[PDB]
Curated annotation (Swiss-Prot):
Descriptive protein name: Flagellin
Gene Ontology molecular-function annotations: receptor ligand activity; structural molecule activity
Cited Pfam families: Flagellin_C (PF00700), Flagellin_D3 (PF08884), Flagellin_N (PF00669), FLIC_barrel (PF21504)
Signal peptide positions (record): none
Subcellular location: Secreted; Bacterial flagellum
Function: Flagellin is the subunit protein which polymerizes to form the filaments of bacterial flagella.
Source organism: Salmonella typhimurium (strain LT2 / SGSC1412 / ATCC 700720)
Gene that this sequence comes from: fliC
Keyword Secreted: yes
Keywords of this entry: Bacterial flagellum, Secreted
Length: 494
């Protein structure tokens, strides 16, 4: 007998209902996550896009940061410029004062001194102000700021290299040259050189003394008044050949030799003046060993001379200066060393076309005493060439020579350039904000849009699921009782 199936059949619909009980399960699943490709969202692709739109907002939060960064850049750059503008504005005033014939050259030099700091600070700002590494004022560059979610939908900012060169104010000078004069400065002193002394040759010429051995004891006494060399000679066996004798020095190598061939010792022995116990040869600084050597290096043909400088101004006042190695007409800024030697001053910059080089420092410039230096084919100033790596920062301008014509005109021009650029940066701040208000406006709708699509239980929805839980709960519960009955009835056959 198979009653099992007949009843089971009836129980099978019950099971179908258990499948409906299973629906409740899927329903419970719903309440967990939300919308899925299970039965609710067939258009997975559509919603995939939605998630992606949210994702786009994710990229847009980051874009908000980016654009923000852009804005920060605008304010930082515009900020840097505010400083430059102030500086320039300061210049204008100086330019106005310069046009007053009452101001002496000196006064003009003071004005210029300020103007120089001005231009210098400017340059400092130019290649030193930055934002996250990027030197904002260092070069022209159109920063494309990504604000859209697609190619082409961007907002670009404009960066421009501002500096005394581009601004064409690098050579803004309002000085007037002085009248240079010179006086022959006969410096009095001696300096030791590296020339070694070869005392071995002495006995070779001192044979004129006789005995067994003629040798100098210790060191030779240089005489700083006649350049003569003297020495103590202990001639063994030389009746009365003991004392001091004069010795010749072969300047070319140091060989020392019996001077004048004196047979008898000097009346007095050693002249007091001969105090310099030398180990190496003394040189008459007057010959400018060093000075001339350097000049030769540079290809200077003109003979050199030591002169003291004197500058005259429009009011007959004459101010004295340092030492200067005159060559025909050119004046080099030299200095006297500790012992008396005279050495030319040098710049000591860094590279011109590779390798480290050094040039001498001449006197000149817009005033007449500015230290100018010749590097390559340009004449720079001592200061500006000082440790300036020409390989990293090539393009530079030469020293100011003449008065700038139409100062005020050029000055305004420079500022015109500044503001015209500034307006852009600023403009972008508002375009950026617009984009923010644009996207921002969309964001609110978007969140909503997708929220109306994605299924979730808050108020209107939850109610349906709550009732569903208890309802269904009674489904399984009640069906359990309704199920007990049939299973019992079956075995009533008595």
């Amino acid at each position: 007998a198979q009653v099992i199936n007949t009843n089971s059949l009836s129980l099978l619909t019950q099971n179908n209902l258990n499948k409906s009980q299973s629906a409740l399960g899927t329903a419970i699943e719903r309440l967990s996550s939300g919308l899925r490709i299970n039965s609710a969202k067939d258009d997975a692709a559509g919603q995939a896009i939605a998630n992606r739109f949210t994702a786009n907002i994710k990229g847009l939060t980051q874009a908000s940061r980016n654009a923000n960064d852009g804005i920060s850049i605008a304010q930082t750059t515009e900020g840097a410029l505010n400083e430059i503008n102030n500086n320039l504005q300061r210049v204008r005033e100086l330019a106005v004062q310069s046009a007053n014939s009452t101001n002496s050259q000196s006064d003009l030099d003071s004005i210029q001194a300020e103007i120089t700091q001005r231009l210098n600070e400017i340059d400092r700002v130019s290649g030193q102000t930055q934002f996250n590494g990027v030197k904002v004022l260092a070069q022209d560059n159109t920063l494309t700021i990504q604000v859209g979610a697609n190619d082409g939908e961007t907002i670009d900012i404009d960066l421009k290299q501002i500096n005394s060169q581009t601004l064409g104010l690098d050579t803004l000078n309002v000085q007037q040259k002085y009248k240079v004069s010179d006086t022959a400065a006969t410096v009095t002193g001696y300096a030791d050189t590296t020339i070694a002394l070869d005392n071995s040759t002495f006995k070779a010429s001192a044979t004129g003394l006789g005995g067994t051995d003629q040798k100098i004891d210790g060191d030779l006494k240089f005489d700083d008044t006649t350049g003569k060399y003297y020495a103590k000679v202990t001639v063994t066996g030389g009746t009365g050949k003991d004392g001091y004798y004069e010795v010749s020095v072969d300047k070319t190598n140091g060989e020392v030799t019996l001077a004048g061939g004196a047979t008898s010792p000097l009346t007095g022995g050693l002249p007091a003046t001969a105090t310099e116990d030398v180990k190496n040869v003394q040189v008459a600084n007057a010959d400018l060993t060093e000075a001339k050597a350097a000049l030769t290096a540079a290809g200077v043909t003109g003979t050199a001379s030591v002169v003291k400088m004197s500058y005259t101004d429009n009011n007959g006042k004459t101010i004295d200066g340092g030492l200067a190695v005159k060559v025909g007409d050119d004046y080099y800024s030299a200095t006297q060393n500790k012992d008396g030697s005279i050495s030319i001053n040098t710049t000591k910059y860094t590279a011109d076309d590779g390798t480290s080089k050094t040039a001498l420092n001449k006197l000149g410039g817009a005033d007449g005493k500015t230290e100018v230096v010749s590097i390559g084919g340009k004449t720079y100033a001592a200061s500006k060439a000082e440790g300036h790596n020409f390989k990293a920062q090539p393009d530079l301008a030469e020293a100011a020579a003449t008065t700038t014509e139409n100062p005020l005109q050029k000055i305004d021009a420079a500022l015109a350039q500044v503001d015209t650029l500034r307006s852009d940066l600023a403009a972008v701040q508002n375009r950026f904000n617009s984009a923010i208000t644009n996207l921002g406006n969309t964001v609110n709708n978007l969140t909503s849009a997708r929220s109306r699509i994605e299924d979730s239980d808050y108020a209107t929805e939850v109610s349906n699921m709550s009732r569903a839980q208890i309802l269904q709960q009674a489904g399984t519960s009640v069906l359990a009782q309704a199920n007990q009955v049939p299973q019992n009835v079956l075995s009533l056959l008595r």
